[PDB]
Design a protein around this ligand. Structure first.
Ligand SMILES: NS(=O)(=O)c1cc(C(=O)NCCO)c(SC2CCCCC2)cc1Cl
Ligand SMILES: [Zn+2]
Length: 257
């Protein structure tokens, strides 16, 4: 029943998911002058050479590109993490207007969109068990600004008309997620939560400082998606972002000075 409307959006979620008002909720504003450089943080090891994408799905909240996570094939290691995190899926959050759409903000700046690569800690064996642990998931977050097209995004944008409505999926094999990364892996990190219900507090957030540029045509195709299912009234899938939450007793650390 949750969503992003006036009636069912972020200010309502706490009634079904009381952790919404918890101590380590996401997203947050990243105050760049308060984040402390941590010389002990390691470079982020993104190993996506063996990634096996399988499918793309309109889940009614976002669209997601899913991967085979039954073996280490696409993994995130290093940075603030202990151990090995397998890539499950990526999805986006976007706005109705280019001045909004990201969940994390940087000195209160909103980006047009935000990409989340969702990974789970292999020690916990499966993602449902990982959801129950404070170090269960790691999300690599990447900001999108509107300018030049991102060539590595076009295969995704070109299949969206086939998954226009909630519950539609399409085979999506041989997609390389390396094409969605910026040149620099400099990042901020903090302990947080899912930004969508159940808002579980199990995520180590790794947010890249460098945003990727996507064209206005690419983000317009995201805005043609629908939150509704086939044969129901049309509600464009836009503004599917949760606003920044209180930082509370948390420190954001920077990998770079
Ligand atoms: N915006 S986020 O914090 O990066 C995030 C989003 C999703 C996600 O796909 N949410 C849509 C509703 O299920 C998931 S999927 C998750 C898989 C296990 C069951 C709970 C949802 C995971 C994360 Cl970390
Ligand atoms: Zn997300």
């Amino acid at each position: 029943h949750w969503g992003y409307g006036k009636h069912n959006g972020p200010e309502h979620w706490h009634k079904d998911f009381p952790i919404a008002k918890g101590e380590r909720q996401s997203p947050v504003d990243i105050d760049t002058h308060t984040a402390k450089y941590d010389p002990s943080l390691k470079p982020l090891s993104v190993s996506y050479d063996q990634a096996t994408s399988l499918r793309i799905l309109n889940n009614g909240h976002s669209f997601q590109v899913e991967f085979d996570d039954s073996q280490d094939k696409a993994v995130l290691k290093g940075g603030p993490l202990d151990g090995t995190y397998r890539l499950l899926q990526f999805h986006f959050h976007w706005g109705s207007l280019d001045g909004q759409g990201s969940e994390h903000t940087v000195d209160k700046k909103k980006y047009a969109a935000e990409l989340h690569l969702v990974h789970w800690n292999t020690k916990y064996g499966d993602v449902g068990k990982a959801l129950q642990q404070p170090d269960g998931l790691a999300v690599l977050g990447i900001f999108l600004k509107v300018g030049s097209a991102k060539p590595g995004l076009q295969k995704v944008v070109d299949v969206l008309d086939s998954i226009k409505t909630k519950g539609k999926s399409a085979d999506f094999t041989n997609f390389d997620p390396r094409g969605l990364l910026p040149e620099s892996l400099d990042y901020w990190t903090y302990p947080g939560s899912l930004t969508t219900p159940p808002l579980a507090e199990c995520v180590t957030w790794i947010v890249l400082k460098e945003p990727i540029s996507v064209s206005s045509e690419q983000v317009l195709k995201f805005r043609k998606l629908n939150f509704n299912g086939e044969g129901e009234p049309e509600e464009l899938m836009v503004d599917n972002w949760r606003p920044a939450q209180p930082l509370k007793n948390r420190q954001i650390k920077a990998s770079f000075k």
